[PDB]
Structures are given as C-alpha cells and as structure tokens.
Amino acid sequence: ARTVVLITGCSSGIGLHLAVRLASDPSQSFKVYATLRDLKTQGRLWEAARALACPPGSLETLQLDVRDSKSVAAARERVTEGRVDVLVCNAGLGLLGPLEALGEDAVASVLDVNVVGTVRMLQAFLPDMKRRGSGRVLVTGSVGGLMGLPFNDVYCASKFALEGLCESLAVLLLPFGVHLSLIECGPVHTAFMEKVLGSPEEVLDRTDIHTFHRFYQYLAHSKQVFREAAQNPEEVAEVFLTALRAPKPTLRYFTTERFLPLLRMRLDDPSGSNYVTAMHREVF
Amino acid sequence: ARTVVLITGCSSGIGLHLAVRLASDPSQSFKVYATLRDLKTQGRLWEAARALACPPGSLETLQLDVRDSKSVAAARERVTEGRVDVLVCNAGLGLLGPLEALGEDAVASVLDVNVVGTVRMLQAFLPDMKRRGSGRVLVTGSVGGLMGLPFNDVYCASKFALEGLCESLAVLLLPFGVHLSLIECGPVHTAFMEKVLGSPEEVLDRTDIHTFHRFYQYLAHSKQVFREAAQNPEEVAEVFLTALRAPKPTLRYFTTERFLPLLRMRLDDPSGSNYVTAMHREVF
Numbered sequence: 315a316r317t318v319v320l321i322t323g324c325s326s327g328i329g330l331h332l333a334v335r336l337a338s339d340p341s342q343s344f345k346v347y348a349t350l351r352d353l354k355t356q357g358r359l360w361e362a363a364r365a366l367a368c369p370p371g372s373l374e375t376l377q378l379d380v381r382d383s384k385s386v387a388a389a390r391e392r393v394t395e396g397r398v399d400v401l402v403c404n405a406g407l408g409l410l411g412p413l414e415a416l417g418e419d420a421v422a423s424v425l426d427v428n429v430v431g432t433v434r435m436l437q438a439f440l441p442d443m444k445r446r447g448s449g450r451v452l453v454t455g456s457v458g459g460l461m462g463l464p465f466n467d468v469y470c471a472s473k474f475a476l477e478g479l480c481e482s483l484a485v486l487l488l489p490f491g492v493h494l495s496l497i498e499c500g501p502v503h504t505a506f507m508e509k510v511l512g513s514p515e516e517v518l519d520r521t522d523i524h525t526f527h528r529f530y531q532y533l534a535h536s537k538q539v540f541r542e543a544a545q546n547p548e549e550v551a552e553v554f555l556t557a558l559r560a561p562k563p564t565l566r567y568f569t570t571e572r573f574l575p576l577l578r579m580r581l582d583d584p585s586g587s588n589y590v591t592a593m594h595r596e597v598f
Numbered sequence: 599a600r601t602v603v604l605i606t607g608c609s610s611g612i613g614l615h616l617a618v619r620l621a622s623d624p625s626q627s628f629k630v631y632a633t634l635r636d637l638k639t640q641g642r643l644w645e646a647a648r649a650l651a652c653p654p655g656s657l658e659t660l661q662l663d664v665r666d667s668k669s670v671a672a673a674r675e676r677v678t679e680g681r682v683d684v685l686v687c688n689a690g691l692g693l694l695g696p697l698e699a700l701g702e703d704a705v706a707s708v709l710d711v712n713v714v715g716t717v718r719m720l721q722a723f724l725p726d727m728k729r730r731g732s733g734r735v736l737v738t739g740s741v742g743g744l745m746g747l748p749f750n751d752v753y754c755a756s757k758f759a760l761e762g763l764c765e766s767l768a769v770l771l772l773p774f775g776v777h778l779s780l781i782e783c784g785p786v787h788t789a790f791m792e793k794v795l796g797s798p799e800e801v802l803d804r805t806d807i808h809t810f811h812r813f814y815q816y817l818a819h820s821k822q823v824f825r826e827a828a829q830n831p832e833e834v835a836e837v838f839l840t841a842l843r844a845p846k847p848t849l850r851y852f853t854t855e856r857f858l859p860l861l862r863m864r865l866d867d868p869s870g871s872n873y874v875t876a877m878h879r880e881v882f
C-alpha cells in the first residue's frame with residue numbers, strides 16, 4: 315500500500331518512539347510493523363500510539379525473537395503486504411560491569427541478540443531487497459561502537475561488531491540499489507538508563523577492591539554525562555527519518571556532534587595510545 | 599622459572615610459528631604452553647620444534663577448546679609454574695561468502711570462537727594479572743578489524759568486536775600494570791588461504807547470479823593482493839616479540855604500513871562514504 319517499515323525491539327526506547335513517530339506521521343504514507351520479544355509488554359506502545367492518535371491500521375505488533383530464526387521467518391510471513399521497504403534493526407542489549415564479573419551466558423546473550431540477531435534479520439530480508447533492486451536498512455548504533463568505553467567491554471564489542479558487519483555489506487550493496495545506514499546515538503534520555511547503573515556487593519565479590527572503586531568512579535562520571543548531554547528520543551528518532559528520506563544516504567548518521575572531538579584524536583593516532591590516555595582522564 | 603607464555607590456536611599459522619619462535623629463542627628465557635583444540639594435529643608443531651631444535655622442556659602442548667570454559671579452567675591449572683606472564687589470544691576462525699549463503703551455526707561458531715572465546719580466556723587469567731600488578735596480553739587482530747571487507751561480513755564483525763573489547767579494557771588496565779596489545783596483520787603467506795577461496799555451485803544456489811559474479815571478482819582480486827603483499831610468518835611473529843619487549847607497549851601494532859593509506863581516508867570522513875566508494879573500486 316505504502317512504505318512498509320518493520321522495526322525490532324519496540325517495547326521501549328528508540329524502537330517504541332520511532333514506531334509511533336512513523337505510524338502517526340501526517341502524510342500517512344507509512345505502514346508500521348513493531349516487533350517485540352514478549353507481547354505482554356506491548357502496552358506502552360499502544361498507549362503511546364493513542365497519545366499521538368495513530369490512524370487505525372498504520373501500526374501492527376508482531377512477536378519476534380531475534381535470537382531465533384524460526385521466529386524471524388514466521389514474522390516475515392505475517393507481513394501482509396508481502397514486502398518490506400524499510401528494515402530497522404534496533405533490537406539491542408546492554409551489559410555493564412568489569413569483565414571478570416560478567417556471567418558467560420550474559421556475554422553470549424548480548425552478542426547473540428545484538429550481533430547474530432541482526433545478521434538473522436539481514437539474512438531473511440536482504441535477498442528480496444536485492445531482487446527488487448531497492449530497499450533501505452537502518453541499524454541503530456552507538457558511539458560505543460566507534461570507541462571503547464571502560465566497563466562496557468562486551469557492549470562495545472557487540473556495537474563495534476555491527477560497524478564491521480555493516481561497513482562490509484555496504485561495499486557490496488552499493489550497486490544493488492539497497493541502502494544501509496547506521497544511526498550513531500550518544501546517551502538518550504532513558505530514566506531507566508541511570509538506574510541500571512548501580513551494582514555494589516554483587517559486583518564486589520567477583521572483582522578486586524580497586525576495580526570496584528573504579529567502577530564507582532565510572533558510574534559517578536557517566537551519570538554526569540547522561541544528565542548533561544542526553545537528548546530527547548524525538549530528536550534521535552527524527553535522525554532516522556532524515557536517513558530514511560535522503561536520496562543518496564551515507565553510511566553513518568550522528569545524532570550529535572558532541573563526541574566527534576574525541577573520535578577525531580582516536581583517528582589521529584592509529585596506535586591508540588592518545589585515545590587510551592585521553593579517555594582514562596575524562597573518566598578517572 | 600622464566601617468562602611463562604600461553605598461546606591459543608597453535609595447530610598452524612601465526613600460533614604455531616610464534617610458539618616455536620618463542621620456545622627456540624637463544625636466550626632460553628621463555629617457557630611455552632602451546633594450546634590446540636584437537637591434539638591429533640600437534641604433529642606439525644613438534645616437527646617444527648625439532649627443526650629449530652627447541653630445548654627439552656621449553657614447549658608443552660595442552661588441549662584447550664576456547665568454546666568451552668571448563669576446558670579453559672582445566673588448562674589454567676595444567677600450568678605448573680602457577681603463573682602466566684604472557685597471554686597471547688590467537689585462536690581465530692574465518693568465514694567467506696555472501697551473508698545470505700552463510701549457515702547460522704557457522705556464523706555463531708565464528709563469534710563464539712573469535713569473540714566469546716577470547717573473553718573466556720581474559721576472564722580466567724585477567725584477575726591474577728591484576729593481583730600481581732603485572733602481565734602482558736597479546737591479541738592477534740587483522741586489518742579486517744579496522745575496515746570492512748566485502749564478503750567478509752561476519753569475519754570483520756568478529757575482528758571489529760575484538761578492537762572494541764580490547765580498546766575498552768585498555769582504558770581500565772592502564773593503572774593496573776598489565777598491558778594489552780593488538781597485532782594487526784595483513785595477509786600472511788598461508789598457501790591454504792588462497793585455496794579456501796573458491797566456492798562455485800554451493801554458493802551459487804543460496805545467492806543470486808549477480809552476487810555470485812561479484813564473489814568471483816572478489817576472489818580474483820584478493821588472490822592478487824595475497825600474492826603481492828603477503829608477508830612471512832617469521833616477519834609477523836617477530837612483531838609479537840617487539841610488542842612483548844617494549845617497556846611501555848602501545849595498544850596497536852601494525853605488521854605492515856601498506857594498508858595504512860586506506861585506513862587514513864576512512865578516518866578522514868566519519869560518515870563513511872569515501873571509504874565505501876574507494877574500497878568498492880579497488881575490488882570491482
């Protein structure tokens with residue numbers, strides 16, 4: 315009927331805001347398929363959809379576990395239009411804490427969901443976009459996929475991974491007509507974000523007293539950055555729209571130019587010592 | 599007794615050459631624990647060890663599956679000295695082909711071995727190095743972890759991941775005394791390398807005729823680069839030694855400056871369009 319968009323991880327954050335922003339667009343040219351792991355959490359999405367008065371039939375919810383390829387396939391078929399014009403790979407997972415204190419299953423989960431998950435999506439929907447000779451894929455990144463952050467080893471690993479995966483495809487898709495873009499977000503006003511950060515005893519028993527004291531220092535400094543730089547999801551969700559409408563999209567979109575200074579000096583010295591020292595001071 | 603080194607994935611390539619290079623060092627100051635997934639492949643290592651006349655007791659082989667944490671633990675205990683001074687995380691896995699043609703288990707395997715595997719190693723040996731206040735960790739990288747390469751989506755994903763994981767730890771380890779370094783290798787004279795590349799029908803039935811024709815073009819161009827830039831493992835294995843002896847090691851060591859030009863222009867334009875076009879031409 316009109317631009318068919320499918321978004322993953324819509325139970326909150328960028329995903330939820332992006333879905334309603336699309337569905338409630340005045341032009342009414344978007345049909346949105348919001349995906350969620352557990353449906354019992356679709357409440358907030360629907361409540362937000364009523365707040366913005368989304369016309370009936372512009373928003374549909376599907377249960378989709380990106381950790382499972384059978385659920386990825388079952389979903390693709392629930393797509394009545396029989397076509398996907400815009401795939402937004404947003405499902406993500408975070409992990410904070412010193413490496414040694416992280417469980418093995420947790421580390422495997424973050425990579426399975428964040429990296430293998432978007433690969434599974436790309437596999438089930440990419441072929442068709444190549445046949446057509448047209449398609450758009452949006453992947454939500456982070457500045458943590460452009461530079462390493464202490465205590466975010468595995469999170470950064472998964473996001474750094476997305477940069478490599480996407481940068482590789484882009485080289486090959488250029489002549490196929492389907493465009494791929496990464497949306498590099500900095501912190502994004504998530505009240506829950508600054509509440510997850512705060513793990514005293516549980517962490518303290520799996521690490522030494524000096525790593526723990528540094529963790530505290532990281533938490534302290536991060537909550538300061540969050541409160542002084544976090545942007546509104548509407549500002550971020552609108553960058554996706556800018557990427558979505560560019561006639562010839564670039565590979566990377568930055569929601570903010572704030573962290574660009576730090577990224578520069580990391581590209582100025584390929585050996586990485588300047589960045590490692592610079593970043594160590596702005597956190598310790 | 600003397601610098602205790604433990605290396606992973608020693609059945610061939612960098613791993614095997616590095617192990618004997620260490621063990622057979624004239625100073626005799628290195629005790630080497632070469633690790634392998636399957637012991638039935640330790641032949642080449644021993645044969646190479648005799649060729650360089652490694653003194654008895656300077657080289658020991660251990661079976662270690664980095665895909666399993668119980669095997670990682672059992673190994674750490676087989677370390678008689680009760681200490682590891684240099685951990686070299688070398689176990690790696692490659693994957694070539696268009697995304698849609700790759701199996702799901704294969705993609706999961708490459709990340710489990712390449713990324714989660716080195717995380718498991720870091721978890722079992724990092725704490726002790728922090729207690730001591732001294733330690734050295736060497737991780738073998740690739741230029742494919744610094745820039746995306748067509749048809750190497752998942753391989754680059756895993757190597758890009760190592761850059762993020764390591765860059766993150768380095769920020770936190772700086773004041774602990776344990777150093778971490780990545781050894782960025784370009785192609786390395788592996789006869790088997792240019793033989794793996796060559797998948798006609800099997801690939802052709804899981805992808806379209808235009809992606810397949812491009813694959814052929816990639817294979818063709820890559821074998822040209824391999825034959826005109828691949829370096830000797832002794833040249834590469836010696837970079838590890840340079841990193842190992844620097845009083846204050848940097849975070850990144852490049853075995854060659856050849857691919858540095860391309861890396862520069864990728865750091866000159868953060869949006870990534872210049873790189874994507876530049877790389878598309880030098881391969882198509």
Ligand SMILES: C[C@]12CC[C@H](O)CC1=CC[C@@H]1[C@@H]2CC[C@]2(C)C(=O)CC[C@@H]12
Pocket residue numbers: 456457458463499500501502507535536537539596597
């Ligand atoms: C590392 C950095 C940015 C640099 C600051 O000094 C510390 C910091 C805290 C929280 C991080 C953020 C980068 C963007 C992150 C990763 C998100 O994507 C959520 C909270 C975020």
Ligand SMILES: C[C@]12CC[C@H](O)CC1=CC[C@@H]1[C@@H]2CC[C@]2(C)C(=O)CC[C@@H]12
Pocket residue numbers: 740741742747783784785786791819820821823880881
């Ligand atoms: C992408 C690139 C380097 C750029 C060339 O145009 C194409 C090419 C072929 C083989 C790749 C290599 C980078 C280094 C790699 C990844 C290895 O690590 C083994 C063979 C290698």
